[PDB]
Amino acid sequence: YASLTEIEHLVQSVCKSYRETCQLRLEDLLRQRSNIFSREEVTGYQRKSMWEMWERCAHHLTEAIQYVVEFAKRLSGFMELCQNDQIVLLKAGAMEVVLVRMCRAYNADNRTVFFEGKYGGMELFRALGCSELISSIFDFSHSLSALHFSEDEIALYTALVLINAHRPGLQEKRKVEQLQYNLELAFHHHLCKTHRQSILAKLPPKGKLRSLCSQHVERLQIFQHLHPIVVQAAFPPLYKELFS
Amino acid sequence: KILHRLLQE
Numbered sequence: 263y264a265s266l267t268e269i270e271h272l273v274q275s276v277c278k279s280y281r282e283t284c285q286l287r288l289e290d291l292l293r294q295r296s297n298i299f300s301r302e303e304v305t306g307y308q309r310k311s312m313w314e315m316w317e318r319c320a321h322h323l324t325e326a327i328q329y330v331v332e333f334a335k336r337l338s339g340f341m342e343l344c345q346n347d348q349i350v351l352l353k354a355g356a357m358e359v360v361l362v363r364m365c366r367a368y369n370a371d372n373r374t375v376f377f378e379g380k381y382g383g384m385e386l387f388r389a390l391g392c393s394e395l396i397s398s399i400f401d402f403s404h405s406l407s408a409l410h411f412s413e414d415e416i417a418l419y420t421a422l423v424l425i426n427a428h429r430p431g432l433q434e435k436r437k438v439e440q441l442q443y444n445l446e447l448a449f450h451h452h453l454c455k456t457h458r459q460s461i462l463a464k465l466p467p468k469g470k471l472r473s474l475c476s477q478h479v480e481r482l483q484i485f486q487h488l489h490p491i492v493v494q495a496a497f498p499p500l501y502k503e504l505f506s
Numbered sequence: 507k508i509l510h511r512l513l514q515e
Contacts, residue, residue, distance in 0.1 A: 331512045349509050500508045 263444050272448040273418065279336035280417030285329045288366055288413055291376055295369050299382040308388045313492045315389040316485055322377070324498040326360040333359070334424055339441040343434060350431040351438075353504055355424040357478060358471040361402060362420050365411060368403035375403065392481040398474055402466065409461050418449040423471065479505055 263269050299307070307315070334340045334352060343351070367376040374381035387396045411419070422445050427438040453459045482505055486493045493506065 328512070331509070335513065345510070345513065348513055352509055352513075500512075503508050 263447060269447050269451050272444060273452050276337065276421050276448060277414050277417045279333060283329050283333040283336060285326060291367055294376060295381060297380045298374060299380045299386065304382060304386060307386050310389050312389055312391055313489050317496050320497050320501045323360065324501045327356045327500060327504065330356045330359045337421060340425065343437060347432050347434055347438065350429050351424055354429045355426060356504060357475045358423050359420045361399065361471060361474055362416065362423060365403045365406035368407050370404055370407040373400065395477045395481050398477060402470065402474060405466055409464055414452065418452060421445050422449060
C-alpha cells in the first residue's frame with residue numbers, strides 16, 4: 263500500500279472483519295467472569311470419559327474454526343488468492359488463530375477459561391489426558407492476557423497469523439508475501455498510532471503457535487490410536503479434515 | 507472437501 267489513508271483503510275477493514283466474525287462478544291465474556299464452575303461441577307467434568315471430553319472439545323474447536331473460516335473469507339486479499347493457497351493457509355493457520363482468540367475467554371486474575379457456559383481452571387480438562395498441552399494453552403492465553411490485547415490488536419494480529427507467506431505448499435508465495443507485508447504495515451501503523459509499540463518485543467516467539475498446534479496433532483494421534491471408532495463416528499468432519 | 511464447500515458458499 264502507498265500513503266497512510268490506504269493503510270488506515272486496511273486497519274478498519276480488518277478490524278470490521280474480525281468484529282463480524284468473533285463467535286463471542288468480549289463484553290459477554292467479561293460479564294460472565296463470576297460464573298465459575300463449582301467444585302462438584304469440576305468433579306463431574308473430571309469423571310467424564312476421555313473419549314467424551316475429546317469429542318466435546320473437538321466439537322467446540324470445530325465451531326471456533328468455522329468462525330475463523332468466515333474471518334478469512336472477509337479479508338479481501340485472502341479471497342483473491344487461489345483456492346490451493348486459501349486451503350494451505352487455513353489448514354496451517356486456523357488452529358493458531360483460535361488459540362489466539364481464546365485469550366479473550368481467559369481470566370488471568372484466577373486462571374480460568376470460559377467453557378460450556380462457565381469459567382473453569384485447567385483442572386476442568388483432566389479427563390483428556392493431555393495435561394502438557396492444556397497447560398501450555400493456558401500459559402499462552404496468560405501471556406497474551408498480560409499484554410491486555412485490544413480487540414483491534416487481536417484483529418490485526420490474527421490476520422497476520424493467517425496470512426503467513428512461510429506456509430509450505432503455497433503456489434503464489436509472492437502474492438502472499440505482499441498481503442502479509444501490507445497487513446504488517448497495518449498492524450504496526452496501528453500500534454504506533456496508539457502508543458502500543460512496546461508490545462512488539464513482548465509478543466510470543468515465532469514457533470510458540472506451531473508448538474501448540476503440533477502438540478495438538480500429536481495428542482490427537484495418540485487418542486485416535488486408542489479410540490479410532492470414536493474419531494470416525496463422532497468427531498466433526500471439518501475437525502478430521504484439518505487435523506487427522 | 508468441507509473447507510472447499512465453506513470457501514465456495
